[PDB]
Amino acid sequence: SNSSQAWQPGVAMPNLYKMQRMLLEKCDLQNYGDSATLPKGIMMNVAKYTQLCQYLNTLTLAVPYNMRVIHFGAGSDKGVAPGTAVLRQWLPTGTLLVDSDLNDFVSDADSTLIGDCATVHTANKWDLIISDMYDPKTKNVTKENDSKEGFFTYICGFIQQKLALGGSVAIKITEHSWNADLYKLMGHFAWWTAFVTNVNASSSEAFLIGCNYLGKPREQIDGYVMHANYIFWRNTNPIQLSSYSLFDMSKFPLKLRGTAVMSLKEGQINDMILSLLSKGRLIIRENNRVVISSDVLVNN
Amino acid sequence: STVLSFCAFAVDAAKAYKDYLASGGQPITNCVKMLCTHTGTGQAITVTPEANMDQESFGGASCCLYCRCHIDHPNPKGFCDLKGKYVQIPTTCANDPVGFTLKNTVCTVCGMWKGYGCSCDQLREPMLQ
RNA sequence: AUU
Ligand SMILES: C[S@@+](CC[C@H](N)C(=O)[O-])C[C@H]1O[C@@H](n2cnc3c(N)ncnc32)[C@H](O)[C@@H]1O
Ligand SMILES: [Cl-]
Ligand SMILES: [Mg+2]
Ligand code: NA
Ligand SMILES: [Zn+2]
Ligand SMILES: [Zn+2]
């Protein structure tokens, strides 16, 4: 429990951990389940999304005008969307925000889709993907900690087909809620990390953050080894629960960079374009009418 | 034609909640309170949290009776003036944001709550250099 | 995972 990390919004996995070849084993946190002291009347997920956004502000996110953001797992047992309200607060005004969840809920997003994420279809590319999806049956550990293939297979497909080059992602994982292919896809970004919010340091939860999608593998990552590396980091680096970053919101809003959006063919992507994508200075996708929908199963 | 006739006579969700509160009923919970500096303009409904030191900022949709109860909004277009925005509630009333938005109206001139920030009806101030 |  390092005190220097307590004034940060959270802790990012050090690069040295990513270069190891660890064997998977149980995640055993010295402070498991402990609750942080939240500001009066602030929900855990408002605090958690606020710290995620505070960390995303320090990265090279592309922020174009008419930015397109999709938020998966935005619902809650409360029937409201705390995370979506924080994303809305964080994102520049005019940012297109669509959220989704298996269960109905009241949202501040421009549009809300109800149903399994596998039923969500779009003809458009997105600039930022946020996922807080977590399968309730993950709590029923019926076998070994293998790579999970429910909503994670959908997210991997969505990243490879619906994420604009230069786009970024923040996907929630835990010791048991993880996918080997998603870690492999972190190698398709200019940079990536596993970020732990300080308000939930007592959980194996982390956000796999992919910064600036390159549409191709910059590095070859073995997902089974990288998750073992993530658990090794969590097991040997206790993180002190802290809500200190929540008390200073003066630099919270994501700065509207007005990042250029261009529709280049795959035959035009070269070293200069890849270099611009890698610095958060370029988004590559068309700018057609945003079309999204959720399938409904028809039956008597 | 005869549905709007029945709706205009009995389904007045707004008054039902006011009576429910007067009956001792617990206010609608899980209104999403936002973290902010509390050094904002203090206006009623804004595109981003604008709470001053005497207010709390909440996600609009979570503070809308019509959104929360899954009922049509009381206006032809069925438009919501809270969803996608942030409502500033006086801290003294932050325990019931849904009830506060129903029982109060925004000043069309300054954009502040009437009786809680609007100073459009105060006496003429002597000019200041 | 929805302190
Ligand atoms: C921890 S809750 C999300 C909390 C939310 N992010 C908030 O701001 O409070 C996890 C959510 O993932 C959703 N989920 C799980 N599997 C899903 C799937 N296949 N498709 C869509 N949503 C899914 C659940 O319905 C649940 O609402
Ligand atoms: Cl600890
Ligand atoms: Mg926790
Ligand atoms: Na905003
Ligand atoms: Zn509403
Ligand atoms: Zn006024």
Residue numbers in the entry:
A (entry chain A): 6797 to 7096
B (entry chain B): 4264 to 4392
Show sentences the authors wrote:
In this crystal, we observed Cap-0-RNA, SAM, and Mg2+. The capped RNAs in crystals #1 and #3 included the m7G cap, the first three ribonucleotides, and the phosphate group of A4. Of particular note was the space between the Tyr6930 and Asp6873 side chains, which is occupied by the A1 base in the Cap-0 analog structure. In the Cap-0-RNA structure, this space accommodates the stacked bases of A1 and U2, with the U2 base forcing repositioning of the A1 ribonucleotide. The structures are essentially identical, with the only difference being the methyl group, which moves from SAM to the A1 ribose hydroxyl group during methyl transfer.
Herein, we present structures of the SARS-CoV-2 2′-O-MTase nsp16-nsp10 heterodimer in complex with substrates and products in the presence of divalent cations. Our structures reveal important information regarding interactions of nsp16 residues with the capped RNA, the influence of a coronavirus MTase-specific four-residue insert on the conformation of capped RNA, and the role of metal ions in 2′-O-methyl transfer.
